[PDB]
Amino acid sequence: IPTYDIYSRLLKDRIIMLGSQIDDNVANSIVSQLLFLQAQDSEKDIYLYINSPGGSVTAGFAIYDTIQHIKPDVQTICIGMAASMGSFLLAAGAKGKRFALPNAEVMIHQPLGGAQGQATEIEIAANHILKTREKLNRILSERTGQSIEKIQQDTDRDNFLTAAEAKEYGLIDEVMEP
Amino acid sequence: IPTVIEAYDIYSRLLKDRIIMLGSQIDDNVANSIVSQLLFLQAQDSEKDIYLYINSPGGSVTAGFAIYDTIQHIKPDVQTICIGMAASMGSFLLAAGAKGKRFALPNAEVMIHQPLGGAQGQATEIEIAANHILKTREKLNRILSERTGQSIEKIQQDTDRDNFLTAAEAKEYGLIDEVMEP
Amino acid sequence: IPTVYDIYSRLLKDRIIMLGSQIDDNVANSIVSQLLFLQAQDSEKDIYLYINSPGGSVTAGFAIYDTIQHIKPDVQTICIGMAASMGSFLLAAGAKGKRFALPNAEVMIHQPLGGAQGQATEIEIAANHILKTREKLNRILSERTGQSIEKIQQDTDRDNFLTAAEAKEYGLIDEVMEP
Amino acid sequence: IPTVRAYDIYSRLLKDRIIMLGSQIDDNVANSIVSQLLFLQAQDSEKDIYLYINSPGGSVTAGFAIYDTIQHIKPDVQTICIGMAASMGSFLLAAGAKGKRFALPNAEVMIHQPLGGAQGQATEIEIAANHILKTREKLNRILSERTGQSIEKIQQDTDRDNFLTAAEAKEYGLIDEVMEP
Amino acid sequence: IPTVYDIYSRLLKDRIIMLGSQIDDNVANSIVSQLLFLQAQDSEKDIYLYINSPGGSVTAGFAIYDTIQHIKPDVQTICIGMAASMGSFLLAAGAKGKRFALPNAEVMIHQPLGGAQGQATEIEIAANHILKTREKLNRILSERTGQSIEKIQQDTDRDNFLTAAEAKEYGLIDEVMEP
Amino acid sequence: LIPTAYDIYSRLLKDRIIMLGSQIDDNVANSIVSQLLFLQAQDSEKDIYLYINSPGGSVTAGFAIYDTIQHIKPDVQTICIGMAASMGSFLLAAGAKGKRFALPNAEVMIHQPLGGAQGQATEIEIAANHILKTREKLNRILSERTGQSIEKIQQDTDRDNFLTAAEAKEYGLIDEVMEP
Amino acid sequence: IPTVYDIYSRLLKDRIIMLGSQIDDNVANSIVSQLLFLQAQDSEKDIYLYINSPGGSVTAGFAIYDTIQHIKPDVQTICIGMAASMGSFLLAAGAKGKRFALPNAEVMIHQPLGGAQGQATEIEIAANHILKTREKLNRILSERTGQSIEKIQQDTDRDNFLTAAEAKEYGLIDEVMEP
Amino acid sequence: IPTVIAYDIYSRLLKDRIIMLGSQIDDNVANSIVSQLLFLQAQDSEKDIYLYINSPGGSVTAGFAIYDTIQHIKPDVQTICIGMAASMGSFLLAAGAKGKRFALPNAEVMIHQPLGGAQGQATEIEIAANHILKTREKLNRILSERTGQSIEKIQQDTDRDNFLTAAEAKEYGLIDEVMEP
Amino acid sequence: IPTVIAYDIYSRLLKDRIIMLGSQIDDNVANSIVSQLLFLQAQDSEKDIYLYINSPGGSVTAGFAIYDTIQHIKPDVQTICIGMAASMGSFLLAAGAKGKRFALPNAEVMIHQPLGGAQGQATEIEIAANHILKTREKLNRILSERTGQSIEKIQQDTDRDNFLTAAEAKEYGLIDEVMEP
Amino acid sequence: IPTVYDIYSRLLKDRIIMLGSQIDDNVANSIVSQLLFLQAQDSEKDIYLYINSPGGSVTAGFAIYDTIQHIKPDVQTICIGMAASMGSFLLAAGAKGKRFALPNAEVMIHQPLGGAQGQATEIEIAANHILKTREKLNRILSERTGQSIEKIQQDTDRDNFLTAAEAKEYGLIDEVMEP
Amino acid sequence: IPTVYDIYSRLLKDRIIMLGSQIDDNVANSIVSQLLFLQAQDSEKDIYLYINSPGGSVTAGFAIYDTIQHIKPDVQTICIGMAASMGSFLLAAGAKGKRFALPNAEVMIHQPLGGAQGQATEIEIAANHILKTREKLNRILSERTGQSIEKIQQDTDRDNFLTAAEAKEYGLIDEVMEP
């Protein structure tokens, strides 16, 4: 990472690069970048590049809620792949400012997790992850215009979409052309 | 494991006298052996009692139900005798012996608790697993209710956490019929 | 972690502390030092503590908790992502009226976890100590939420997940911070 | 394990109603010892049985499977300590028929409180602590009955590892006689 | 570890030292050097030692202990979170009248731990050494707490957890620091 | 199993010969005790022969063998081949008086007991007192069986002390070097 | 390790060298370089070597030992916590009259440790070498304490723990440093 | 390991007074070999015994248990090297009855000094060194007696690994004859 | 490994003077093969023995224990390669009685120079190098005698892995006949 | 593995050999010995070789194959479950007209697998060898199925799964054994 | 490693290079670079190479050796602690009359170590190469000590430990550096 690295130079121009799995460390850093950019200028757009296989749903919601909280628009730009929570964040960008490059891929599926121990503990974990899926699907419905029933069906298995398909689905607004 | 010459290992020698020893965790291999022994004893004599000693921390619920159903399926009464400890599916099998012929020795310990499991993967896979283990707990509790005389609701409450019982407490609960005194 | 100052050090300049990890003695040492430094800079201005944490060490969390209550500035707490176990205890520890969660943040409360090994009398000592620790946590959660101790005991017996709105109803936070 | 029809040496001794407890006690060992006790009773409910004990102890519940079977069966079970009887091993030594509990002169006996573990939620640690304390009370009460010592004395004497010579074990009431050459 | 100086170096500028880890030779070397440095800068002004520690090496602790007693400034000790074993020994070693704990901080005292392996005579040497080390710890604790050596022996036979208020009654601290 | 299943050791046991050729642990001690009891049951008057090639091992396991030897009626000859070290040399010295042997190039080693202790100071104290008492017990018996003073045994066992067969006879650990 | 310079660098400005670890080649390299640097800055002013060390490599220790005797400044030695094995050898190596221990610091002396593997003639070479090294260590210790080599041999056969007062009586240090 | 009707192949050969050493020498192997030698003398104290040796060597004390038993018993023990006899294996080859030590033509013999290890305090390393040096003196003295070579030549010739052909072992005096087809 | 009534299958073949070498060659395998050869000679010193070989080779010294025993005993030993005979395996294949060395048509033969290792001081590496070089000369000389190929040719043909069909092994002189159906 | 013999031994009495595992030298040695024994018992009666095998060593497979072709009795081959790689080669090697599969048995053919490591010239030798081995396998498969060598080469470039009916149609077996 | 520059950089300013580790390609690269830099700064003034090293790679040692001989400044060598194997070779390589050891430093000489695995011919190549390397080392050692090659061969057959005074008498150094 070349140098005050290349990411800090892009941050000076209100660009945040997500290029990894989403965990609490990544979310803490991105949230802090978003807050800092709003403090610098509450009006100018922010640009969030997303190449991510997804990761923690709660870490992803830290980023998601910060995006919706701050005053500047956050443009989202998918490069390479936005899968799982990554495609949720892609769809979370400012309306009209969600993009994917022509060969970028988008994948949606249901959340993953685990449960171990007593029957009642497994029941609690199952209820929690099912409620988490409902929350994701409700928001994806609002952000895409698709019905919750259709999102439920379309995420039962791994669902790969081209950029053109992601646009038609309502996950992005435009395929960014050269 | 000593040998007895009339050449039997000690467990085979006791099987000759219609005694089956359960002294390990319950898995499919152990259940396969126990079931085969029960079927063999029935084939030998369908009237004489069988004696099942139980010192077991429990284990696989489905393997325990292979044993449970075989006990109920065969014609001879299967006396159960707890020595040391009968916990989880082990206490379930202890309570499954022929009515009036379920025993524990005075310092044997009985422990009841809800079944354990796990689930990994997609939310809908976790839901299927949760629904399955919950249905399995209902099945266990319903049978325990029948065999002890306790209501299902009391069993649910009394198995939420590990519940250790003395032999005397096990008799009062209905899990055994008598403490076998010296 | 980009440079502007690394990003966290830049936010600290504006009296913002980020808790975004498991709570251990190292994290608590750092958070406590930041709180003391900010009080030294200005004893009157608010401090903002963002919390995204699965929890962790009870004693480390109480190092942070007691420092929050000790210092003069109000400490606002803001849950983003998840505040679980000791993290949710710290969320509820913010200045009354200044405890927040964002709309999709999750809150989870549950009894403390631990272990005990050795002689019977050593297991007894360890059990008494963790039981006392839970009573201590529940007493404070009762005063900070308005709920009875009996209700907190019962509601923490197993993992209990709360939405942001449920956390407000419960008294763990004061407001869901809307966009 | 040499052979002596063919017997291993332990099977040969079992023909003379001798059982050798020469290892840590777990469920596998207890299962074998119990089966040997039941077999010998089935062969002859009158004749004494001889239980040699060289054991560091082990599982308390497995030890009680052995303990209760000894008390259940009709024959007297003599106990003979060689080398070491520690923890649950010393509990079983004291469990022999009264008047027929022995140690050889240099055998070592050790008594101490039970050991265990617990992990997880506070309430789970509470349940495990209550269970091991009740197990200790059960062990101390029986040891009081078999030794003549008060439960309060047994409690104080098992708080830490307590090593006894054979002659001290006799004075304590854990055995009846030191078998002198 | 945020930057302002890193946060700990910034606190050191105000004569605050943070012990927030297990005690070992490296930690003691750092703490001793900070104490000698602070005395060199000003031999009259108080030093503040925050303690959140599970304890650790007895000899490393005594490097710290003897340096506190050696230097001219008073060293205040402030327990946050937990001071256990050699950590609670150092808490009680602060200047008399200037030993503190925050209300929910926990203090634990117990006898030293160690090991030995090899020949009978090697084990005997190691046993005699740790027993003498325990006598030394107990004698000093007795002096610093006002409790008899026999009571300290009894009270440290097993893990002994104390609240901050109990630590004050015991004589391990002078006051519970209230908000 | 080595050659015939009825192995070579079982064939030697028919002739009242017990072959110790390993470290001494509870399994080995239980086997040897059982063999000794068996041989006494077969004939309480005929000698037993115990060959010893052992680096030593568990002190309590060794005392199970030692006390059984003293308990039974038959004389137990001891014959050192290769090495009898630590508790192996203790058992070598415990054979019937006048019937303790070593072959000419066999080696004997004596030293103090080994052990460990971990935990609280008072737990280490208990463990140290126990191993010190075990050493006094070993030295007292070795004094009785060799004729050497307890103080000399203490000195001579402070460190590993290797002895030739002839030196072990001079020391009193054996009665005769068995020459061809 | 806080910044002021790191804390050790800051103490080095005042001619203080902190030994707070095992002695190996890397540690010896650093301490020798610090000694040479301090001589080059001022050949007259005393140097201060603090020692909390469990010992370590004999040859690395002699790199430090010989450099102390080589340079012109006096090197005071101050034991804090523990000086064991080669650590106690270095403590005894300070300028005569300027060897100190703090009151609860401990000192341990014993013979060197090592290993040998391979052919009989290789084990013989290794045995002769460690025996000659012990003779070298005991001879120098005899000169530095005033004790006979026979007494030092007897007193290092096994681990031999000494209090600070005992180390003064032994001649390993000159004074116990009281507060 | 095949069976001959029931003997395993080695037990079948032992019936004909043949003992096969085909492994490293440790206490277990020595226990077996010593027991076989004692057994064969008990059957017949006059007829020769045949010890085939293919061994890389191993424990010196285990080798001396075998060595001393060979010299103790009345029957002659012929030794026959096949494959390799190295270190303590070549010591045992040379220990066979005079005139009855053999190697097949392509068997190898290797002699060298004993190997060992030592850890701990200087005085413990000294004790370990003195013991292995004394052991080497014992081995060389006996090899001198059995080969006819001086002790000083044995010392020189075993300082490093020294490989000999069958014919060279005969000229050296380690064996009496190369057994030709 | 199935049983025939009671023989395991290998023991049943041994009854018919058939030895199966079906694994890597080490001291344990050579100990068993040698014992079987000696046993069969004792049963009948005139009747042929049949040694099947499916082996990747292995220890050169273990292989020479088998080799020399084959040449020492009176019966002819026929050798029959099935599957593969590589390295010391192909050396033993060529060691069969002249005219009675066979391979089945799809069996594979591979010859190559010996493998080993050396570690330590320069003079120790030199000793190990000299020894493995002398071993290679020994192997090459015997292979020259048994195949009719010059030593120079065997040297160059074994510098690297050299794979031979059964037909090529016959032309090379490693076997006498390809055993056709 | 039950008794009555073990179950495989009881079937061998009836001239049935079960191959139900990977083909390695141990398996091949046993199967070759079983074939030779059965020929010695009766040189005229058929032998039955059941095959459920994922393949294995090519040379081990050829020990079996050559022994099948060498002995006088016919060897029927019967595929149950799966015959893959060297397993399908042995299936095709049965006596002509006496090679079978059960209706849901699967057959798989592909090219041999191997590895090579070292100098360029060593890699070249290993490549030439495995390429020659494939030519041998294909030539025999061509003879035993009636397919051209070119077709066999094409059809084994990748894993090629075949139903029992496709295997019969291919020439690898003669009949699908129907219930 | 304290700051002043780390301590080694501070000494390099005064033309001092410290070797205090095993010799590998990484250490040799750094030392060679320092030697070349120092010559470029000043081709006339002496360079001082301190050596405490157990040795290591022969080729890496020759990288240093040849660079010492190549550059114009005299390189003094000073053994502290131990110089063994290639370390003692480099000690003996210093400028004539400027090779030193401190009084208790030890010097060890022995033959090179290595290994070889694979075909007979590969083992032969490796043996020939290490024997040649030993001849190369012994030839240069003979030139630099004045001892004959045959004596060096004898004296390096096994590990040979020398005191500083013995190393001077041998010709490996010129002077024992006294205080």
Residue numbers in the entry:
A (entry chain L): 4 to 6, 18 to 192
B (entry chain B): 4 to 9, 17 to 192
C (entry chain M), E (entry chain N), G (entry chain H), J (entry chain G), K (entry chain I): 4 to 7, 18 to 192
D (entry chain C): 4 to 7, 16 to 192
F (entry chain D): 3 to 6, 17 to 192
H (entry chain E), I (entry chain F): 4 to 8, 17 to 192
The authors write:
Bacterial caseinolytic protease P subunit (ClpP) is important and vital for cell survival and infectivity. The caseinolytic protease P (ClpP) subunit is a compartmentalized structure with two stacked heptameric rings that form a central chamber containing 14 identical catalytic sites sequestered by two protective axial pores. In any case, even the degradation of small oligopeptides depends on some structural factors, and the most important one is the orientation and positioning of the catalytic triads formed by Ser98, His123, and Asp17224.
Aiming to explore and explain this paradoxical effect, we solved and refined the crystal structure of native ClpP from Staphylococcus epidermidis (Se), an opportunistic pathogen involved in nosocomial infections, as well as ClpP in complex with ixazomib at 1.90 Å and 2.33 Å resolution, respectively. The superimposition of both tetradecameric structures displays that the complex is slightly more extended than the apo SeClpP, and the Cα RMSD is 1.63 Å for 1451 atoms. When SeClpP monomers from both structures are compared, the Cα RMSD is 0.12 Å for 164 atoms. In both cases, the monomers are composed of a common structure consisting of the following main parts: E-helix with a Gly-rich region, catalytic site, head domain, oligomerization sensor, and N-terminal loop. Despite the similarity between the overall structures and the high homology between amino acid sequences of ClpPs from different species, a closer look into the monomers exhibits a difference in the Gly-rich region. Figure 2c shows that the apo SeClpP has a more disordered Gly-rich region with an unstructured loop and two small antiparallel beta-strands formed by two subunits from opposing heptameric rings. A comparative analysis with the native SeClpP, the SeClpP-ixazomib complex, and SaClpP Y63A29 structures revealed that the Asn42 side chain in the complex, as well as in the mutant, is shifted to the “down” position (the hydroxyl group is approx. 5 Å distant from Tyr21).
